[PDB]
Amino acid sequence: MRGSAHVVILGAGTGGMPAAYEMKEALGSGHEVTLISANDYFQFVPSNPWVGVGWKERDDIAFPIRHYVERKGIHFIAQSAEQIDAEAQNITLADGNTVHYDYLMIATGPKLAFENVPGSDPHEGPVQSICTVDHAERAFAEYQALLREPGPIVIGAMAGASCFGPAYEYAMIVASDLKKRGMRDKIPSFTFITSEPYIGHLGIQGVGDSKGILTKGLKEEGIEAYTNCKVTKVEDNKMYVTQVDEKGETIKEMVLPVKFGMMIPAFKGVPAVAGVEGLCNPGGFVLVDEHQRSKKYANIFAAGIAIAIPPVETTPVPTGAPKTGYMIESMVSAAVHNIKADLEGRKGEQTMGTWNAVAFADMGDRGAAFIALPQLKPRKVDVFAYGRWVHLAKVAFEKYFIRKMKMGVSEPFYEKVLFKM
Amino acid sequence: MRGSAHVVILGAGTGGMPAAYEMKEALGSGHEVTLISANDYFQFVPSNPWVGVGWKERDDIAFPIRHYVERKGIHFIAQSAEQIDAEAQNITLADGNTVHYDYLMIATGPKLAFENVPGSDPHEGPVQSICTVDHAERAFAEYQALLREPGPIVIGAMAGASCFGPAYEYAMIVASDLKKRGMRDKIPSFTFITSEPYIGHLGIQGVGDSKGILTKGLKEEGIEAYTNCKVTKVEDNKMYVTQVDEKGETIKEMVLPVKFGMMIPAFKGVPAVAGVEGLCNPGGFVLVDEHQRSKKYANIFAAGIAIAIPPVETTPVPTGAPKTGYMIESMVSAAVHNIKADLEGRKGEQTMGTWNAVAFADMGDRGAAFIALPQLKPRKVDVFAYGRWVHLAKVAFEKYFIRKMKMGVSEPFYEKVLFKM
Ligand SMILES: Cc1cc2nc3c(=O)[nH]c(=O)nc-3n(C[C@H](O)[C@H](O)[C@H](O)COP(=O)(O)OP(=O)(O)OC[C@H]3O[C@@H](n4cnc5c(N)ncnc54)[C@H](O)[C@@H]3O)c2cc1C
Ligand SMILES: Cc1cc2nc3c(=O)[nH]c(=O)nc-3n(C[C@H](O)[C@H](O)[C@H](O)COP(=O)(O)OP(=O)(O)OC[C@H]3O[C@@H](n4cnc5c(N)ncnc54)[C@H](O)[C@@H]3O)c2cc1C
Ligand SMILES: CCCCCCCCCCCCO[C@@H]1O[C@H](CO)[C@@H](O[C@H]2O[C@H](CO)[C@@H](O)[C@H](O)[C@H]2O)[C@H](O)[C@H]1O
Ligand SMILES: CCCCCCCCCCCCO[C@@H]1O[C@H](CO)[C@@H](O[C@H]2O[C@H](CO)[C@@H](O)[C@H](O)[C@H]2O)[C@H](O)[C@H]1O
Ligand SMILES: CCCCCCCCCCC1=C(C)C(=O)C(OC)=C(OC)C1=O
Ligand SMILES: CCCCCCCCCCC1=C(C)C(=O)C(OC)=C(OC)C1=O
């Protein structure tokens, strides 16, 4: 309302949860902040692969949101938004109730586009997913069914995927867990299928010696790897795969039996956001400027996986570049700053800064990680790391981020200054 | 003097040059800042290996100091200090003139301890050095003599060395340059000799896969490598090397003929500083507290290679851990802050922060670099990088640091925030 603007944050994930706290800290008691989310709990997404192999449980990586945001004066609605009317500035919830906003910050993450590959939905066949804790639990249940009745394994990433690290991580920890259980020798075949033009491309044209290291890692585990692949369908417990050459021409088709499978799907924008006229590209991603502001609606901002970022290359099989946590938090920080600036008679000038990708993977006792910036080469930083210390750093960061999601954030967010003293 | 304290910075190197500018910026026109240095020019030390193979010249990496510091109100004395009387607070210069100080910041870098190995002084025999531009020029002259009359090459690091990267870099670029000149096949033997307990230890117990990468790099260049070595003498154009086992017992002695040689020497404190009673350890390094303040004299501070840092391990052949640029600048920044604090009735609380080591090496088209922190394992960051981008980053940083040494510094110093936007 006038003089007391209502800011709604849609989606309580890696971007949206911090966005809610930061928005309320920034605006104070004179304004209303409402966080709306499909789930009543927060989950630490990067730990889902471990849930998928039974190395972690839901309770380790997830917690109920309400009390933590409410104690900060933030309203919480645990309902999915089904429609957004950008003209009237009304959000229609799954229960049919309506929420009006003065500013909207979209942080809705990805729609997991299983529809791209008929039969690939985790509920339709043997190809599972570890992108959410619900799905990771389902993946682990199927993994146990595999242990009871061993059969072919296929892990990888679909055409159009932008999130490749977790596929490699999952393959490695499944292989590891099999060995632990003395079951590895009972698997007839273990295959890695990816849309990447080469192993370790990771949607970022490689980082450090990711190609050499991941290539050798898969080989060492007896995992046969295929690149430039797209899955045309999953049917009768078989994955139908087409492999192309540099020019997109078929060099082979394969039919792979699958007892246990996990393929990272392509991401699209969620339906309620994609459905807003003029807001998004054909993929459903919000078209925003450098200030995280929608190009169509001046009072809609967006951050996280939900925003559109232009491609920098065109791979033989479509692939996308990942949108990772540090860049996401930079988007959130900028959006919050610029909304506040708007509420104070200014055009905020803050941007997300330089494009970058960062990621951790934990194989158990040791981890891998990378940092790449900016997007195109030659880069200013292009590094891949491996070792026990990376495992320890992942453990530490998870513990930290979860505590911060409970205690609240406000500051820029980062402890780079704390560990450098 | 009273109400107008005189601060003297001794040594105009990586630490001292910035220290002079930062001190004057911090104190302003009410105080006097004098920079005293043995040479009338600044040199960018990390580029010396390239001067040593003729890939760079003195004029590329060095420039006269006077005008740049004087235009900032800093007094410049291009004389070596020969004696320091800490009681009277008087510095005796090489010309016999005396300079009084109220505060002294020692930034005198290393004494190159060739005396540890009889015959190893660059002027005494074929074993040269690339630690200074004077010496690197001499190394290149001898390298040309090698080209005229090919013979055995021996490159490496002496017992007690703490600076290992440049030995590997130099070996690699000499091998590279030989190939360029079609002379590589004319070298009867090319040997790498190091006090490190293993290749790629680097005085920091390894970083990333430094061991594997440097091991393979030397092998690829046909360079035979020996670890756990100390040179007992250089004589009649032969290097007498003793190799020990884990327990320091001789497993062999070797006598290596040398036509062209380069061994990084051990570092000690410079004589004028080491000669100050109670100031230093037996090695000549200033014993300081966390605030960079001498433990003996409250008005003497120290930064850079000149300070004592306790060892964290005891290798079969003595080795030391490197003191590198980012940590050095942190020492400088803290010293300046705490001297100013003293001049304003306070004990400055600023410290150099977390121990870390960083380094670049440039092989021509591609570079290597590492970051390790803190000193003991498991680390919070332990990374090794290689590629064209590292070459480009080294070129950029050199260009930047040299310009900053001409234009002046004041700020914390760093552009991490500039390239992240
Ligand atoms: C398996 C996996 C591993 C990853 N590993 C890393 C890593 O190591 N490092 C890294 O930096 N990044 C990693 N990422 C990438 C990225 O950081 C995460 O995907 C991150 O969670 C994305 O944040 P987000 O805020 O954009 O979306 P999300 O965290 O997915 O949050 C979206 C939120 O919006 C909600 N929502 C969706 N639709 C609606 C609706 N219509 N109405 C209301 N709410 C809705 C969702 O329930 C969810 O709470 C990983 C990603 C995955 C999937
Ligand atoms: C070959 C080489 C390569 C290196 N590579 C890297 C790298 O890649 N990355 C990195 O971060 N670090 C690197 N270092 C390590 C370190 O950063 C440098 O040695 C750095 O120059 C040390 O800074 P300093 O200020 O302590 O000493 P210096 O830079 O050596 O400065 C000491 C100054 O004191 C003067 N001085 C000495 N005695 C007296 C006296 N009695 N009276 C007056 N003045 C005196 C000297 O002339 C000199 O100007 C490298 C070192 C060397 C030798
Ligand atoms: C972060 C997301 C992107 C990637 C996700 C998943 C990656 C899976 C990791 C597979 C790699 C396993 O293979 C592993 O790699 C490194 C090689 O560089 C080796 O380790 C080697 O380098 C490391 C440091 O980096 C040294 O500490 C070690 O002594 C050395 O042998 C391991 O001996 C090898 O077993
Ligand atoms: C910084 C100071 C400390 C070290 C100083 C001097 C180091 C000398 C460098 C010798 C290494 C040369 O060997 C080189 O190493 C890397 C392997 O990791 C290889 O490069 C490999 O990893 C890089 C990324 O890191 C990839 O871009 C490349 O595609 C891959 O092949 C090169 O193919 C090999 O030729
Ligand atoms: C320098 C080499 C590795 C050490 C990096 C330490 C800190 C970076 C952690 C990466 C990370 C960031 C930044 C991050 O913002 C984030 O989102 C919350 C993650 O999880 C999804 C991350 O894993
Ligand atoms: C993250 C991987 C590598 C990129 C690092 C970029 C900036 C760091 C440069 C290293 C360096 C620092 C910090 C430094 O302070 C310094 O002294 C002036 C150097 O020269 C001696 C350096 O080479």
Ligand SMILES: [S]
């Ligand atoms: S998923």
Ligand SMILES: [S]
């Ligand atoms: S990734």
Ligand SMILES: [S]
């Ligand atoms: S030297």
Ligand SMILES: [S]
């Ligand atoms: S080094």
